């Protein structure tokens, strides 16, 4: 891939230049060590002058002049090697600065781009979007970042220890403080950012229901963390409690309810190299709520762990995607609309649960189509024609051209607060009502094309006129939520086009949609041409004999 293999180039380049500094560090370590032994030779030259100063000037003539020559040269060498030791120290800090600034570039790419892309993909998958996929790619990149930063951290620890053993003043001290300032800044960011929720908890959480979540740390294996697997504490929080948590204005263990099994320990898995806490049996015990259906909450996962050193401790916190809490499950219907809006229209880097008031119509379309396909479980989504029908209903306009609605904004109030033109419901109620009846028992029929649905009473009439005396279509009724009305043709005294009473799921519980179509004589050709028993053959109930009626084997009528 494009910037996928570009990452690997600037990753390998980091490992190469980090090895060059490793070579220069072991080299300087030797240069210094020799210099220390040579300095003791300079000290030992003087003590030699004392034992030399005993005998006659017959021996002292040669001894004192040779010892002077050896002391001058060694003293000039020690003085030049002393500058060399300092110059080399600087060149190592310059190199360490260079590989760290380059490491920051690669860090930001992994964390602020590829990670955010994964998290956005995850966000939209809540609304039915495409799956975000495995973290494998980002774990490998995070491990590299963790490894390279750790290597550079221990290198500058060793570089520092040499300086304390042999101090040389100047720029070195300040440049070393700067590399350390950067080194901690990089690890802190790397640590906090890779404590992520792999499998988010249910966004429409029903009280007293077993739910699950999975919080992975991407730098578990490649750092001194899996050795002591840390305890992770799940905690339900409010939208205000989250805005405070992020601005650092929290007050102790502030929260909004109890969670059974809200504590779990991370597990290290060899081969996968993954450190992950799978909260398999969580459950909501109670809630706080100072609309109920428009109330955002979040599962706050926290943990504390050390990274090798006893001093090096980090406190990690990650927030779940906003969840709406329900108790009776009856209001799942409206909860879904708030979650839908949030998952679709959340702005990157927003303050906790900041969604826009209005959005342009085709933005909302994208979302409705996304969720629609996902719910009815079919590849047949909302066509440009169906999109016009919903634009007509929502905006209360007459136009049949989709491009007309392009600049129009749907507010949250227009979507699921104020009711439609002359109805006892909102657009989301009508739309979700339709997905619900389809999903509940019409998934095959929708997929098979047998339910045109998104056509108005007029649209249906200006279609079945030019059709034989039994042609009919299936339509979504505007008056009865989740209702499917039949539009058919049959020439009689006054009327020749007819709209039968809409069927609600109640009616479908008694007799099937297919059992009801086959039950009616007049209905004989499904629109446009297709015969009735051709489209609904499959779904016809083969009346099976009862046991009470005395049948030893399964029989049909």
Ligand X SMILES: CN(C)C(=O)CCN(C(=O)[C@@H]1CCCN1C(=O)[C@@H](NC(=O)c1cc2cc(C(F)(F)P(=O)(O)O)ccc2s1)C(C)(C)C)c1ccc2occc2c1
Contact positions vs ligand X (CB under 6 A): 457, 477-480, 485, 498-503, 507, 516, 519
Q: Which is nearer to ligand X, 353 or 428 (CB)?
A: 428
Helix (H, G, I), strand (E, B) or coil at 557: coil
Residue 475 CB, shortest distance to ligand X, in Å, is 7
Which tokens belong to 258? 């109890």
Residue 507 CB, shortest distance to ligand X, in Å, is 5
> What span, in angstroms and rounded, lies between the C-alpha atoms of 360 and 383?
18
Q: Which is nearer to ligand X, 2 or 492 (CB)?
A: 492
Q: Which is nearer to ligand X, 184 or 509 (CB)?
A: 509
Q: Which is nearer to ligand X, 384 or 501 (CB)?
A: 501
Residue 400 CB, shortest distance to ligand X, in Å, is 18
Q: Which is nearer to ligand X, 408 or 497 (CB)?
A: 497
Position of tokens 């600065």?
97
Contact 231, 264 (CB under 8 A): yes
Strand partners, 232: 264
> What span, in angstroms and rounded, lies between the C-alpha atoms of 206 and 324?
9
Residue 405 CB, shortest distance to ligand X, in Å, is 21
DSSP string covering 387-417, please?
Answer: HHHHHHHHHT-----GGGSTT-EEEHHHHHT
Work out whether strand 296-306 and strand 323-326 pair parallel, antiparallel, or are unpaired: antiparallel
> What span, in angstroms and rounded, lies between the C-alpha atoms of 358 and 261?
39
Q: Which is nearer to ligand X, 136 or 519 (CB)?
A: 519
DSSP string covering 231-288, please?
Answer: EEEEEEEEHHHHHHHHHT---SS--S--EET-EEE-EEETTTTEEEEEEEEEEE----
Position of tokens 């504490």?
233
The separation between CA 541 and the C-alpha centre of its own chain, rounded to angstroms, equals 45
Cα→Cα distances 554→299, 308, 454, 523, Å? 52, 70, 41, 31
Residue 531 CB, shortest distance to ligand X, in Å, is 20
Strand partners, 324: 204, 296
Residue 413 CB, shortest distance to ligand X, in Å, is 24
Residue nearest ligand X, Cβ-based: 477
Q: Which is nearer to ligand X, 112 or 507 (CB)?
A: 507
Q: Which is nearer to ligand X, 347 or 494 (CB)?
A: 494
Residue 499 CB, shortest distance to ligand X, in Å, is 5
Q: Which is nearer to ligand X, 230 or 453 (CB)?
A: 453
Residue 497 CB, shortest distance to ligand X, in Å, is 11
Residue 498 CB, shortest distance to ligand X, in Å, is 5
Identify the H or E element spanning 486: strand 484-489
């Amino acid at each position: 891939s494009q910037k996928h293999l570009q990452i690997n180039q600037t990753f390998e380049e980091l490992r190469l230049v980090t090895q060059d500094t490793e070579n220069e560090l072991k080299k300087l370590q030797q240069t210094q060590e020799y210099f220390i032994i040579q300095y003791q030779e300079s000290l030992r030259i003087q003590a030699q002058f004392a034992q030399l100063a005993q005998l006659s000037p017959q021996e002292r003539l040669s001894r004192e002049t040779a010892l002077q020559q050896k002391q001058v040269s060694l003293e000039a060498w020690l003085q030049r090697e002393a500058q060399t030791l300092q110059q080399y120290r600087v060149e190592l800090a310059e190199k360490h600065q260079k590989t760290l600034q380059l490491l920051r570039k690669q860090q930001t790419i992994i964390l602020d781009d590829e990670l955010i892309q994964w998290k956005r993909r995850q966000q939209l998958a809540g609304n039915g979007g495409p799956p975000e996929g495995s973290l494998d790619v980002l774990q490998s990149w995070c491990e590299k970042l963790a490894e390279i930063i750790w290597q550079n951290r221990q290198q500058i620890r060793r570089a520092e220890h040499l300086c304390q053993q042999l101090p040389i003043p100047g720029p070195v001290e300040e440049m070393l403080a700067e590399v350390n300032a950067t080194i901690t800044d990089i690890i802190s960011a790397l640590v906090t950012s890779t404590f992520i929720i792999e499998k988010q908890p249910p966004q429409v959480l029903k009280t007293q229901t077993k739910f699950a979540a999975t919080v992975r740390l991407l730098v578990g294996g490649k750092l001194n963390v899996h050795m002591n697997p840390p305890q992770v504490k799940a905690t339900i929080i409010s939208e205000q409690q989250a805005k405070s948590l992020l601005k650092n204005e929290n007050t102790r263990n502030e929260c909004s309810g109890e969670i059974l099994n809200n504590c779990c320990v991370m597990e290290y898995h060899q081969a996968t190299g993954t450190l992950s806490a799978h909260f398999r049996n969580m459950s909501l015990k109670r809630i706080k709520r100072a609309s109920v259906t428009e109330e955002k909450f979040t599962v706050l996962f926290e943990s504390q762990f050390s990274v090798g050193s006893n001093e090096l401790v980090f406190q990690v916190k990650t927030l779940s995607l906003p969840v709406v809490v329900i108790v009776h499950g009856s209001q799942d219907h409206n909860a879904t609309a708030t979650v839908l809006w949030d998952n679709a229209f959340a702005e990157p880097g927003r303050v906790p649960f900041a969604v826009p008031d209005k959005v342009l119509w085709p933005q909302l379309c994208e979302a409705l189509n996304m969720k629609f396909k996902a719910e009815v479980q079919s590849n047949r989504g909302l066509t440009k024609e169906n999109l016009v029908f919903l634009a007509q209903k929502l905006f209360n306009n007459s136009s049949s051209h989709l491009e007309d609605y392009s600049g129009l904004s749907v507010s949250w109030s227009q979507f699921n607060r104020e009711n439609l033109p002359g109805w006892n419901y909102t657009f989301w109620q009508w739309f979700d009502g339709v997905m619900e009846v389809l999903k509940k028992h019409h998934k095959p029929h929708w997929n098979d094309g047998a339910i045109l649905g998104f056509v108005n009473k007029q649209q249906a009439h200006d279609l079945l006129i030019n059709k034989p005396d039994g042609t009919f279509l299936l339509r979504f009724s505007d008056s009865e939520i989740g209702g499917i009305t039949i539009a058919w043709k049959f020439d009689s005294p006054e009327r020749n086009l007819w709209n039968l009473k809409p069927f609600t799921t109640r009616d479908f519980s008694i007799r099937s949609l297919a059992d009801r179509l086959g039950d009616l004589s007049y209905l004989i050709y499904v629109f446009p041409d297709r015969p009735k028993d051709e489209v609904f053959s499959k779904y016809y109930t083969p009346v099976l004999a009862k046991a009470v009626d005395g049948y030893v084997k399964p029989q049909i009528k």
